[PDB]
Design a protein around this nucleic acid. Structure first.
Ligand SMILES: [Mg+2]
Lengths: 558, 405
DNA sequence: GTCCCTGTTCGGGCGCCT
DNA sequence: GGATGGCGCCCGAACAGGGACTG
């Protein structure tokens, strides 16, 4: 039937009018499937025949369902959507089985003909006009309009999900201890009741929905485990993801990699150790989906070790609120991280990965803090609380970092775990000038017009050197000078630069960088035993910042 | 009951469309319990997705109480809302108490054509349920127009208490009422309880301020008996920057001591003219900043520098190098120090001073990653207002300028 | 003013679930 | 083949903000 619920008032954008698009030709098979759908919907009152008083029209087309047998009537409302008002989507996320609590009895049933049972605003039904042909010369084409929610409209998902919440509100208020996970028309129902008393409560839900025009066909009424819910399999005490089959081409293109990485990201929620850095690196700078790209040696190696992880059995458990939430992070190279959330040892609730490369320059401690935040925000969505962490970083290594780091950074309750590779700082800048170390006064200068520059230094022991550069900037010359001082100094050196840009990068202690010049600076800083970096204002006559400034400015400035 | 007052937006500005951020379980349970009681009393109503506007919402649990306070981040709506002398004596009272009179805004209805802009969405744990949206029917708490529309009725209530106590300054900002006096500790609290009873006769907190103790942290210079090249180089760079604020600062004689290419650990004896130059600079930093006038039509900018060891320095200004106040904020120096928890306490004390001194919230430049702040800042918030902020990566130079020895 | 460098946000593609 | 919405990932693109530079 049709729900007796009040419609949602919808308007077009100001100054706009309904669409006027002609129907494209359709396959004979699709025409025969669209007429049986429309002839039955016209009887049920879900669509109404219109005449010449309706100047609007919108194409339609039909695709197969996941059931693969019946047909789904879709409408290409791309024009009406551009002219329809803006909505606020009520679906704030996707439910995850790790957030489910252990229930005594579980039922998963869906609503039949979900959209087509919710009415559409009467003043808006004229814009949803469509036309369907038939056997030519034997009967012309019929023109209907939607009296319910069409599949292809912008506002249909938000209106259905909102109306579904209003319908389930009296049942939830009356049965506050019956948990109903509501995703579109799928209904996961859990209770702490005996199976006989639970099935009684299910019929009360089916009679309540039937009162609001929503039927629950027995074909989609699951009564025994495993329950097929949101793409998982719910057993009484554990869950698992439906089988994931990776593609296996030999001439991988952009579109092929885009779906391989997409499936691996979906797999990393329960399969620990998934890494997609090298595969995602190939997709850089591409232009077309059909653009073929050969895999690299590290990409072949990364894809191989991923395929081995999926050929292993793994499952998740359900959340117990009386116990703690524990997250354990493991480090992979090239800024990759994986984590495992559990309450009992080796009984994971779920897993995951973090590899978002943030900032041009960073280190492992920054990336670990970023992973702690992404996990904390993700845990608040699924369980509503913050987990306790098990991080592969020493207490002293963290105390040292947030002591010298000028920004406020904090990690919640955690403890150190000895699971290499550990997170460490590969070098430490000195806080005071080094006694017995040669003092380098470095400076760089570049010309904006010709892109020519010079980087060099003068030392308090009489040494000086100047290197010419081509196609450089003023910031790069300042960095090139610091790299030159490290190259020609001993294991302990004092450097004085006038570039707060270069000083700010080095004080943050990066171990990886997009810039190869900065990486070369990082490698030098690791080999040094002591480094002290001071700053003086440029063009103020301070020595020996003046002697080096006059040396690099010669021939490129003034 | 009472006739509504029409309120519209600014020209060419749509309503707010900010997405709700994840809330913890104990905060959602509190908001659901509060919204149901607000809906029973007609203060809010359910709305659908045809309302394209949304404003985030959360809750705070005050110190020692099992009561939650609903908080709506309405500062994005206040920027779009269509646009009394500030008491200069409030910053001079011995003690000032802050009262939360936000409940009084529920007695006045809201303009019907404006209610659609005050929408918010209550999320569900693990997305068990789509977002349940509401909208306000009366004057919302934390909105710019709520104290303005209620300004007429507010003066009627406080008038007899203002007359009976002329030596008491009562200033209102957002859902807060600032009450200061020169009474002794005890008679002040007795007088605060008198106002609480007088405010409960109509319909229907923390902690305790002392604006007399609000001091400034001036730029101080190091004092040594043995100076090296590094010590003088760091001093010259600090005075060179400080001369942007204090034009009297000179650095001629200190710079000539560094002629040549010297080692950083070489000890340099101060000449008489250089030692005198350092003495004159210390007196200049003691003088107040000249020619700084408070412009109400511009934002108050507040920078914060993490100095470590629980020390936090801040400066309030509107124009570059035109500081209105430079102070510090120190807390516990333990090993379990929470940087985020200390930073939110700093921005609350700084905002509280701005509301007292100038009656406006400052715009913060916060030295913290954006993701780090939004994840934990609501767990330590305790005020009914929310100042606007941006996130920055400060140079470690400003850290050393406002340093402390 | 311009050039440079780095930050965040946005929408494109893919993955998953009427 | 030809629709919509949610969330996730990754990428490049279009901004905004601050610092340094020419004469
Ligand atoms: Mg320089």
């Amino acid at each position: 039937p049709i729900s007796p619920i009040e419609t949602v008032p919808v308007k077009l954008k100001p100054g706009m009018d309904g669409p006027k698009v002609k129907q494209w030709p359709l396959t004979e098979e699709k025409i025969k499937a669209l007429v049986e759908i429309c002839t039955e919907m016209e009887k049920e009152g879900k669509i109404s025949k219109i005449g010449p008083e309706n100047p609007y029209n919108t194409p339609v087309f039909a695709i197969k369902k996941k059931d693969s047998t019946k047909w789904r009537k879709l409408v290409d409302f791309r024009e009406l959507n551009k002219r329809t008002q803006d909505f606020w989507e009520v679906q704030l996320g996707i439910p995850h089985p790790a957030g489910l609590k252990k229930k005594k009895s579980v039922t998963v049933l869906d609503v039949g003909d979900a959209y087509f049972s919710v009415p559409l605003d009467e003043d808006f039904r004229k814009y949803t006009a469509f036309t369907i042909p038939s056997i030519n010369n034997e009967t012309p084409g019929i023109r209907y309009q939607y009296n319910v929610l069409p599949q292809g409209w912008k506002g249909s998902p938000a209106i259905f999900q909102s109306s579904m919440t209003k319908i389930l509100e009296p049942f939830r208020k009356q049965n506050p201890d019956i948990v109903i996970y509501q995703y579109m028309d799928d209904l996961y129902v859990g209770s702490d009741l005996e199976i006989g008393q639970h099935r009684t409560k299910i019929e009360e839900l089916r009679q309540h929905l039937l009162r609001w025009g929503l039927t629950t066909p027995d074909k989609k009424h699951q009564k025994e485990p495993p329950f097929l819910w949101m793409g998982y399999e719910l057993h009484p005490d554990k869950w698992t993801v439906q089988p994931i089959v990776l593609p296996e081409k030999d001439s991988w293109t952009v579109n092929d990699i885009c779906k391989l990485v997409g499936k691996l990201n979906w797999a990393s929620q329960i399969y620990p150790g998934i890494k997609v850095r090298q595969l995602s690196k190939l997709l850089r700078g591409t232009k077309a989906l059909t653009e073929v790209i050969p895999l690299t040696e590290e990409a072949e190696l990364e894809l191989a070790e991923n395929r081995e992880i999926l050929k292993e059995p793994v499952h998740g458990v359900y959340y117990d609120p009386s116990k703690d939430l524990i997250a354990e992070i493991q480090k992979q190279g090239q800024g990759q991280w994986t984590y495992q959330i559990y309450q009992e040892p080796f009984k994971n609730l779920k897993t995951g990965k973090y590899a978002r490369m943030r900032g041009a320059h960073t280190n492992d401690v920054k990336q670990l803090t970023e992973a702690v935040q992404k996990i904390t925000t993700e845990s608040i969505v699924i369980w509503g609380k913050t987990p306790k962490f098990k991080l592969p970083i020493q207490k002293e290594t963290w105390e040292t970092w947030w002591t010298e780091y000028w920004q406020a950074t904090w990690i919640p309750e955690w403890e150190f775990v000895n699971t290499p590779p550990l997170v460490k700082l590969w070098y430490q800048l000195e806080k005071e000038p080094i006694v017995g170390a040669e003092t380098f006064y470095v400076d760089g200068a570049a010309n904006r017009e010709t892109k020519l520059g010079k980087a060099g230094y003068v030392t308090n022991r009489g040494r000086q050197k100047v290197v010419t550069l081509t196609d450089t900037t003023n910031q790069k010359t300042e960095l090139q000078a610091i790299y030159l001082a490290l190259q020609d100094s001993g294991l302990e050196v004092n450097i004085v630069t006038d570039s707060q840009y270069a000083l700010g990068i080095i004080q943050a202690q990066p171990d990886q960088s997009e810039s190869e010049l900065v990486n070369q600076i990082i490698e030098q800083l690791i080999k040094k035993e002591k480094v002290y970096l001071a700053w003086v204002p440029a063009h103020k006559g301070i020595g020996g910042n003046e002697q080096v400034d006059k040396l690099v400015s010669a021939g490129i400035r003034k | 009951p009472i006739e509504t007052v029409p309120v519209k937006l600014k020209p060419g500005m749509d309503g707010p469309k900010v997405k709700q951020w994840p809330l913890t379980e104990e905060k959602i349970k509190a908001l659901v319990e509060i919204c149901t009681e607000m809906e029973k009393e007609g203060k809010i109503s359910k709305i659908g997705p045809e309302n394209p506007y949304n404003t985030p919402v959360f809750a705070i649990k005050k110190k020692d109480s099992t009561k939650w306070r609903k908080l709506v981040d309405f500062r994005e709506l206040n920027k779009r809302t269509q646009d009394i002398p500030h008491p200069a004596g409030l910053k001079k009272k011995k003690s000032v108490t802050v009262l939360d009179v936000g409940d009084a805004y529920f007695s006045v209805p809201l303009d019907e054509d404006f209610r659609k802009y005050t929408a918010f969405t209550i999320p569900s744990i693990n997305n068990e349920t789509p977002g349940i949206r509401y909208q306000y029917n009366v004057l919302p708490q934390g909105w710019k127009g709520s104290p303005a529309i209620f300004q007429s009725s507010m003066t009627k209530i406080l008038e007899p208490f203002r007359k009976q106590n002329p030596d008491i300054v009562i200033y209102q900002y957002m859902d807060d009422l600032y009450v200061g006096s020169d009474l002794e500790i005890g008679q002040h609290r007795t007088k605060i309880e008198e106002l609480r009873q007088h405010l409960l006769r109509w319909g229907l907190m923390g902690y305790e301020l002392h604006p007399d103790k609000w001091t400034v942290q001036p730029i101080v210079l190091p004092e040594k008996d043995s100076w090296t090249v590094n010590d003088i180089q760091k001093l010259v760079g600090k005075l060179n920057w400080a001369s942007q604020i204090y034009p009297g600062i000179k650095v001629r004689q200190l710079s000539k001591l560094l002629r040549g290419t010297k080692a950083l650990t070489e000890v340099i004896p101060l000449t008489e003219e250089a030692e005198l130059e350092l003495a004159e600079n210390r007196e200049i930093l003691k003088e107040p900043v000249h020619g700084v006038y408070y412009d109400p039509s511009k934002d108050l900018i507040a920078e914060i520098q993490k100095q470590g060891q629980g020390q936090w320095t801040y400066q309030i200004y509107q124009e570059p190098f035109k500081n209105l106040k430079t102070g510090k904020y120190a807390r516990m120096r333990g090993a379990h120090t929470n940087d985020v928890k200390q930073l939110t306490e700093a921005v609350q004390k700084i905002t509280t001073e701005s509301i007292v001194i100038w009656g406006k919230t400052p715009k913060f430049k916060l030295p913290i990653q954006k993701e780090t702040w939004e994840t934990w800042w609501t767990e330590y918030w305790q005020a009914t207002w929310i100042p606007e902020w941006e996130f920055v990566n400060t140079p470690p130079l400003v850290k050393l300028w406002y340093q402390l020895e």
